Symmetry: D2
């Protein structure tokens, strides 16, 4: 139960972030949907508010320090606190290393890694006040732990998020701030639903051959894990990553 808590989810206009925001709101949290896509952010907030929850849409480029600061402070002013941060905005750009654009490389690191750093820095200024505390969750991937070809930038970024979370777990403990990384496997999306006919079988072998059961991870799987971490009564799980992938990479 998260009644009375406040959450900000970046990238929540779509996909995994959207489901996380809907389920945190369903659990009683007030939720700020932060996204580059301001229209989509407002659509999610207006869905939560029409269901009886409390939500705001926040226009936020997570690569832009001042926009991140302004958006996080806006959440704290609207809701009174920033108790849960889910750093989730992301994109994918594929190429082999020898033809990988350096501009693409930096954009990938800025969205995935700098966005996590910047939103964490802005949130901690609130969570640390009077040691109120907080939960900070980064959206990793099985690619935080394992590589695939053509994804050097993404894999590098998702690996780096583990390091940031592990430092935060150490620094944040004295202020009652916990850190975690959630690492989904392959989530079936509308784009995946178009590739399955295109690529062709593809499901169980090409896409999910590295799972134990050939089953896609769902946005519900991810959000339920986020809610469990967000509501956990102690700091016992701080610093840990959680692989939600149907057995693709086991630790």
């Amino acid at each position: 139960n998260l009644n009375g808590k406040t959450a900000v989810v970046t990238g929540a206009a779509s996909g995994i972030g959207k489901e996380i925001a809907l389920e945190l709101a369903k659990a009683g949290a007030a939720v700020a949907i932060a996204d580059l896509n301001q229209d989509g952010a407002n659509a999610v907030a207006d869905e939560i508010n029409k269901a009886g929850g409390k939500a705001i849409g926040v226009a936020m480029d997570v690569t832009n320090e001042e926009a991140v600061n302004t958006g996080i402070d806006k959440v704290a002013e609207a809701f009174g606190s920033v108790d849960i941060l889910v750093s989730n905005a992301g994109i994918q750009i594929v190429n082999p290393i020898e033809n990988y654009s350096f501009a693409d490389w930096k954009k990938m690191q800025a969205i995935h890694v700098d966005g996590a750093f910047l939103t964490t820095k802005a949130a901690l200024k609130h969570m640390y006040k009077d040691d109120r505390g907080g939960v900070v969750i980064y959206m990793g991937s099985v690619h935080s732990h394992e590589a695939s070809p053509l994804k050097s930038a993404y894999v590098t970024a998702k690996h780096g998020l583990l390091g940031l979370a592990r430092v935060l777990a150490k620094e944040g403990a004295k202020h009652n701030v916990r850190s975690h990384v959630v690492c989904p496997g392959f989530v079936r999306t509308p784009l995946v639903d178009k590739q399955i006919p295109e690529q062709a079988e593809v499901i169980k072998k090409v896409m999910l051959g590295n799972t134990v059961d050939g089953v896609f991870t769902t946005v519900q799987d991810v959000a339920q894990t986020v809610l469990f971490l967000s509501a956990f009564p102690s700091a016992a799980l701080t610093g840990q990553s959680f692989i939600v992938s149907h057995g693709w990479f086991m630790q």
Copy 2:
């Protein structure tokens, strides 16, 4: 919510297992407490039954194949299924390697490793029937992932449990069986009580000095994690270990 589910918890006359049995029963599971200490198992069962739950005590030396098979079959006949196995019974025997008796070594592997193997094998015969499925949770340790001196036998066995669980995740998938390993940090139980005199200085420094916050893990921390895994709606977390240790070893 575990209404309609059946669970066997080995080692549940005491400590971590006892809390797991009580919390599983409060969630609506019928619970079999299986323990070398049959009187203690009966006492936990009586506590559950007096509170409105459903439980039985089972005599079970988990090193003894007949006792394991008889006990699991008893649960299945009493409750109709064996849906959740928590393999938790364990002891600690401390000595440097050069003074570690081979008798102690084998006893440690028999209780920790053979006990997990024997109880899993017996439970799978029930869980695999008509692919009913199941959840198998091994009680590991931060010592499944990291070593301490004087604990060669224990650390070896706790490391071995990860291997068994990861194989079960692969084998069990086609029968809807999941596997997990829970890895607590220090928890105040008789297993800890018996060590400290041999070794508040040992507690705050030697033990809790590995955590980020200086806090013992509680039996509630562990049981809440077991309940989360037990109720999870898909197999997305299968094969994974969960470190519940307040930041002692981060993966």
Copy 3:
């Protein structure tokens, strides 16, 4: 270079252990080949001696405490010390967990895990003497770190060896003893050259497809690990001038499982 050092390699009558013994001896170590197969152990020792090295064969069941203690003390009396222990004897027995024989389970843990414990403890009695020191290497597997179906006993044992080695690294430090685990991918030993036509027939696919897709599908390059790959890693660990690598495992698998 290992001149003046003594090494004991268990399971070295054949395969990976045999190659480790030959390369340790070529580097200057006096090598004892400890194996259930006494003729095969004497054969490897004689191959070393004829090439100008120094070696003996030692009959040893690594599951038996008396045999291990007697054999290790024999090496110490023959060569003067026991500086390097390579715990390598193994066995594979496959079955799904729900039909895994407990007799076979106990045999798998006795050979892999008890063998490592017993030989380690016997060797420490010499290595700890006057804090002389030593290097203890366990032969693990990619299956020390990752699972495959039907191999519960093997995977559990190989995972456990990591734990033993990590404890030894902590306890052994004050006596100048280091520990490591070497983790090969698939190597073309006899038991494996048998697996390949057997798996081909059973899976109904070509032999090349068993190699490239089933056995080596998780490597980056489709290449078997060689006995030379493993032995050169053991040589490097054995001669390393400091304890900097103690407690670590080394995956020698052409990219199957990366840490």
Copy 4:
């Protein structure tokens, strides 16, 4: 035996990189000393040339794409190939996350992570030619695997390097290119030598308390591990990281 091989070591005007360059040269490789500090790079090269080896100094800001491309092409021009890349240049900047400068954050990412990416990409243009092959080694840290407070930027970067190396191992294999990450523990440097009297107690407790033996890692430890990887006869070790830390973090 690296006779006839060519190597480039970034950051090799000083410290770990310098010892690596000296030992690669002593093993018979031609060595380019790439460093921001051109004075120091020329000095190491001159040390090598006076001892009978072959070396060049290369002024190279590893954060700058043009400087990296021009520098690596100069090595291939001078020596005929680029067979070994050691990506080693680094810097450390400490601060808690909530006070951390984004300017420092970006500098840390640029040197540690962008430098690895840019030097790798430039080297592959040469190593992939006719599948000649190559060895690419990133200098990580125990902080590639484990966190310390105040080092968020550094720990994040060093964790990210594992991801990049793991992708390179998969992509490079078809071209005979291997990747590794070498992870030194605490290396005693002149700066360390003036902190011990500032703080044989600070050594074994504050600095080396997390080692098993209280021994500093040496530059020789690191360079010997680099030489072993550089001469390995097969790709068997590709994608792996090597912890050279006297037991601080065990995998």
